[PDB]
Design an enzyme around this catalytic site. Structure first.
Site: not given
Lengths: 324, 328
Positions: B78-79
């Site tokens: 996840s960014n």
């Protein structure tokens, strides 16, 4: 300093990069620390090399070149930035690469900066060692020219007097942005263009500030002649005098270029955990380790504010993980 | 004038100056259409991205609440989690992350490199779960445990996508309108549509500032049928918070994410290679590569409203390149 506008120059960065206070790191070290965010430039994950390439690639276009040729380690930030700029401008790119640390680790060999070279369609040429970079680049340039291309050679790290003009430019930003009582500036000193460019600019703009280069590949004795030579060359081109002493600390890079060390890795963790700032194992981590120990050993000229120049390098984090 | 209620929402400054809006001459030459890019991938915090705009509002809210801990969820790569962790470290807030493996990979770089590597640098407390089946409920259970230790937790939903977080992209639309003024008459805007905050925030802002522009969301995880009510719910909630109406229809294309969220596909890969080789621009296999593949196909199939300039919102994602290499 007006002679800077006489050089052809491409716009890769635009606005001045941020200069930020680091309140948590400052609290921890008991010393005011600031950071020049040259890692935040807009092209291909950024870095200091882009400032040099603004001048170098402008020169390349003036000569009507269609190919950029440069050299560095497999994980070179300079090669990565050169290749990104090449792609952007529709120029071919040929990279002469070496493995400086004798590793067979998959992520070093294929991930990080090296991975990006493939995305940018860089032509890769491998060599055992860059024992004479200038001559090796010249040999490759003739072969590429014999294939029907018009090559332009960019030296290792982009560190020529022309390339180093990018860091005279950075010094102007620093001077404008610092207008409190700054005492010291710390920067990684490698191929020497960044150090030398800052040296010339800061002498004229902020003469009372102490500029410290933390070597990442060489002893003080090997590195000092290189920095001085560029310093004088830059000064001549800008029609300036440069008499300031070059300061170098060489205690922070063992066992050699491109090999992570504990102090360096702990500096990376410290900046990430206190400030959300990503350094790197080859350059900035070692330079930050130097700054921290400089506080430890009371090594700076006085107790005042320190500015760290963040030259980038973070894509190497993914190449160096998990080891070697 | 119309988006003036944005003033009343407290925000931290993480981005600073408006991000670059650039013409892409070589991509435009290849595609036969004027292409511009909004560079939300170039922000000062830990390798940048769209999620940072949301965090300006979310974390300001957290600080007003007296919270000292940020809790959120996402994929291992996840960014959002990475950006949340970075902001937490910067502000001396604790961070707890609930992570899942959405693709069932055992690849070592997916498990430990890229965004996941940075999480350890930011001292994120990592909580693994089998799957984010009910992210809101799972986040509350975690928040309870964390509160029992004496922490004061602030729960940030997956992707930072609440009406408040989406204000970041209402703000982005204001930048876009200003940057395009007397410079380019846009016809279309393309953005990846995931947790829907970015799409929804842009929808509200663009309806009011540039009503004739067509906003296209390219789904990265869901069909049009599943995604559209999520975008609309946010759009309406955002409009309400701003004392505005939002009557625009939401547009989504779902043809470009198969075989599923977080799984790279051929068209995505080719879009990544195209932007890198022509513009020196780095996209990603999960989000922007797929959104760009949609833009390219949209041009090929004449899917857009007309033949006019298209603005691509670069939402970031590039650190995932190092996690997905060599394969998953």
């Amino acid at each position: 300093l007006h002679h800077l506008t006489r050089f052809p120059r491409l716009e890769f960065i635009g606005a001045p990069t941020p200069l930020e206070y680091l309140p948590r790191l400052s609290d921890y070290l008991g010393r005011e620390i600031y950071i020049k965010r040259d890692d935040v430039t807009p092209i291909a994950m950024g870095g200091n090399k882009l400032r040099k390439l603004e001048f170098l690639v402008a020169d390349a276009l003036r000569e009507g070149a269609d190919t950029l040729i440069t050299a560095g380690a497999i994980q070179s930030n300079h090669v990565r930035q050169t290749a990104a700029v090449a792609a952007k401008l529709g120029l071919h790119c040929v990279a002469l690469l070496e493995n400086p640390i004798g590793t067979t680790a998959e992520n070093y060999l294929t991930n990080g900066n090296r991975l990006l070279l493939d995305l940018f369609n860089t032509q890769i040429e491998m060599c055992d060692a860059l024992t004479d970079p200038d001559a090796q680049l010249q040999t490759l340039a003739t072969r590429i020219e014999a294939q029907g291309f018009r090559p332009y050679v960019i030296p290792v790290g982009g560190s020529s007097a022309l390339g180093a003009m990018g860091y005279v430019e950075s010094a102007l930003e620093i001077a404008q942005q610092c207008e409190v009582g700054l005492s010291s500036v710390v920067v990684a000193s490698g191929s020497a263009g960044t150090h030398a460019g800052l040296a010339v600019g800061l002498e004229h703009l902020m003469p009372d500030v102490e500029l410290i280069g933390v070597t990442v590949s060489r002893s003080v004795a090997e590195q000092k002649p290189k920095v001085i030579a560029l310093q004088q060359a830059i000064a001549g081109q800008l029609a300036l005098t440069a008499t300031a002493d070059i300061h170098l600390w060489d205690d922070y890079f063992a066992p050699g270029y491109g090999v992570p060390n504990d102090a360096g890795m702990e500096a990376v963790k410290l900046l990430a955990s206190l400030e959300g700032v990503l350094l790197d194992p080859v350059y900035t981590g070692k330079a930050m380790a130097g700054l921290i120990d400089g506080i430890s050993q009371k090594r700076f000229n006085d107790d005042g504010p320190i500015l760290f120049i963040h030259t980038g390098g973070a894509p190497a984090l993914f190449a160096y993980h998990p080891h070697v």
